[PDB]
Write a protein that binds this ligand. Structure first.
Ligand SMILES: NC(=O)C1=CN([C@@H]2O[C@H](COP(=O)(O)OP(=O)(O)OC[C@H]3O[C@@H](n4cnc5c(N)ncnc54)[C@H](OP(=O)(O)O)[C@@H]3O)[C@@H](O)[C@H]2O)[C@@H](O)[C@@H](O)C1
Ligand SMILES: NC(=O)C1=CN([C@@H]2O[C@H](COP(=O)(O)OP(=O)(O)OC[C@H]3O[C@@H](n4cnc5c(N)ncnc54)[C@H](OP(=O)(O)O)[C@@H]3O)[C@@H](O)[C@H]2O)[C@@H](O)[C@@H](O)C1
Ligand SMILES: [Zn+2]
Lengths: 390, 390
């Protein structure tokens, strides 16, 4: 096994966790700040969560911007960038799921970006030239992405069919309110999506090259084990507080930097999946459920050791040849996704694979030609993975 | 099974981890600052670490203060506090173990304390009235306490036989340099002490009362499993980087706030142990190895469920009655400490238990009369625990 690489870990986001944790929200925002509350397509109005937020900040200088959609659009967000500049917003409060949080991270950085440069430049450069951003916090209504306490975001330009990520410490939220009760109203589709996303985030940082990082491994395995136990329960028992709190906390811990610090990371499943969302409109987690089992089969030898550890530690699979244990672990993973209600073949979404050449052209356009922890997933390999996922 | 309590988790310490991670040190400290490098009895001069730190901060306005011995003494630290006030120090850099870091946390707070109040008041109030402190960073040479990325400190006043803790967010280090290579020089005694302290920190937050916090449980179990595997290897292979890296990271993750957030915590072993260090001079971890097995036997009824989970998850103990399993778990724990070279009976250290009445007087003086997660360890229970530890 290889060793940990040197790392620099900073996890500054203050977490306010639990039932009624919104009581601590007002405290976190500077009293003289001009706050823009961002939110999504309207679920927060129906549930009363937006009203709770507005009441927490009663008397403060508050504006609202609604309409940030799943796979948040540059086209949507430029409206808020204009508003933020013209109204001199000095603090952003994101209320919703990962799309709302990510859209708000983009607004935060875009507002301070050089005036004469199209802020889509952030996505073309992965956020490396971001020098500052408007501070933000969040109230998370959907556990999936860990965006509440990480420095990443995924923004789409819908006109041209691009879905790309950026990263910058400047868009790391100052705080996050995590109240499991706010997740009770999630449609099961989204509950399942969130369990899958947290699961896949974990394996992107854990089912990789073997490194003797025992805490990282145990923590990753712990998240996976918890999602397998309580994920399905969150569908059967939607208002079980303990179950929903376990899922919410698992999703946070899957991508705040801790389990990936100094260890090789894959992300190929994510990169391949992004193109499926961009071209075909599939939910982010749906694309991962399709790509992951096909990718793991294709990459079963570079990933042999960690697939075998995963098989044993997460699924209690120990018997047979390495090939048999890996087949069984992949099958168990596919079944887990399917049983959550997340199908794992392109044909389940009415896609026959004729779009694969077009997806590869988009991968190439986006510089996704040497994917994976070994930088060995070329366009011919990506073609084979997509083909296997039909 | 009970539920998670609401919590407020903030872990702001930047971690610079790995071989030669001191190359990131200079960047962290403000150029304009007047830095006081604090250190211990002299090992840092002998090894070469203090020179690496001075080399890293070459040209900057630095001062030095050595002499902070294990169980950092109020008398010594007040000499540092006077130096900090006279020289207008604006930043502290602790280079050493937990005693050095903790002593520096006290210097940081006591220096800003009201001039006409004895800053030992900090320990009388547990740090509750601390309004500010001089910012600090650290370079850790001994993994044990997790003090590098927590807001706690334990100071001794040798004059009056006191060893007491304070807590304040103001003494949380801005950064911590964690280079496993610096731990290679640790005497076996201190390697063992660190493994034990990390182990006990974890069980203080985990072997309590059953709460359905699955991530907390898996993470705590993960630290414990890792310390059992690689702790003995750190003695046998002192220069094995991967092994030393696993132990160092485990100790960090054992007390940064993560695994204890919203869950019941015990700390009774620590409170009873502090009085053994103050009275008899035992290393902190030696006092924990003595007290823990005795306390668990005494509290086997209230701790039943988590002792059984501990037994299964950490020691693979599944067969037999509940009492047989608990006995085997306690026995396994005791053996583990002993095989690290840390005896678990007072008589192993030449203490016959005649000091127990005097220990109870000190516990009473310090308000340690209703200890444990159920606040039910009274002085007569503490007597019973000490007596069983003979
Ligand atoms: N920042 C990051 O590090 C990452 C972000 N990712 C990105 O995150 C986005 C997905 O975020 P999610 O949190 O999964 O979901 P969305 O925010 O899109 O929301 C999905 C739907 O759920 C609904 N919803 C959210 N909270 C609800 C509530 N409690 N009650 C009822 N409905 C609720 C939303 O409905 P509304 O828009 O009406 O609010 C939305 O349709 C995708 O765009 C994905 O690419 C991922 O790529 C991830 O891998 C990495
Ligand atoms: N801040 C906190 O959260 C807590 C701190 N605790 C407190 O922490 C203190 C113990 O700290 P540790 O890190 O275990 O050890 P110390 O700092 O006292 O040092 C012990 C000896 O180790 C030696 N040492 C440290 N780094 C070395 C190196 N790498 N090479 C060779 N020798 C080295 C030290 O020798 P020197 O003084 O010459 O430097 C010391 O004698 C005790 O006073 C304890 O009460 C604990 O109570 C803990 O439970 C919680
Ligand atoms: Zn301790």
């Amino acid at each position: 096994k290889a060793g940990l690489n040197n790392f620099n870990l900073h996890t500054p986001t203050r977490i306010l966790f639990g039932k009624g944790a919104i009581a601590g929200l007002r405290e976190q925002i500077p009293h003289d700040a001009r706050v823009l509350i961002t939110y999504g397509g309207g679920s927060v109005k129906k549930t009363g969560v937006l009203d709770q937020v507005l009441d927490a900040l009663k008397g403060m200088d508050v504006l609202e911007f609604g309409g940030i959609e799943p796979n948040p659009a540059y086209e949507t967000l430029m409206n808020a960038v204009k508003l933020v500049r013209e109204q001199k917003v000095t603090f952003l409060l994101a209320v919703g799921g990962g799309s709302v949080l990510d859209g708000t991270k983009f607004i935060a950085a875009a507002a301070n970006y050089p005036e004469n440069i199209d802020p889509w430049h952030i996505l073309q450069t992965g956020g490396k030239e971001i020098k500052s951003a408007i501070p933000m916090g969040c109230v998370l209504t959907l556990p999936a992405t860990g965006s509440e306490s990480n420095a990443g975001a995924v923004i789409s330009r819908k006109t041209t069919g691009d879905k790309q990520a950026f990263h910058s410490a400047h868009v790391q939220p100052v705080f996050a309110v995590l109240d499991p009760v706010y997740t009770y109203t999630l449609p099961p589709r989204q509950v399942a999506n969130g369990v899958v996303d947290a699961f896949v985030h974990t394996v992107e940082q854990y089912v990789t090259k073997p490194v003797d990082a025992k805490i990282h491994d145990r923590f990753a395995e712990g998240i996976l084990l918890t999602l397998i136990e309580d994920g399905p329960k969150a569908l059967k028992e939607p208002e079980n507080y303990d179950v929903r709190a376990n899922v919410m906390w698992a999703a946070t811990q899957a991508l705040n930097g801790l389990i990936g610090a100094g260890v090789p990371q894959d992300w190929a499943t994510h990169m391949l999946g992004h193109e499926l969302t961009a071209m075909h409109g599939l939910d982010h987690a749906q694309t991962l459920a399709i790509v992951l089992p096909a990718l793991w089969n294709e990459k079963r030898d570079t990933k042999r050791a960690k697939l075998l550890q995963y098989a044993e530690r997460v699924w209690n699979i120990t018997e047979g040849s390495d090939d048999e244990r890996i087949d069984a672990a992949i099958a168990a993973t596919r079944n887990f996704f399917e049983q959550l209600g997340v199908p794992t073949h392109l044909s389940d979404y009415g896609l026959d694979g004729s779009s694969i050449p077009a997806l590869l052209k988009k991968l190439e356009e986006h510089g996704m030609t040497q994917l994976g922890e070994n930088h060995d997933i070329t366009l011919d390999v990506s073609r084979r993975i997509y083909e296997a996922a039909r």
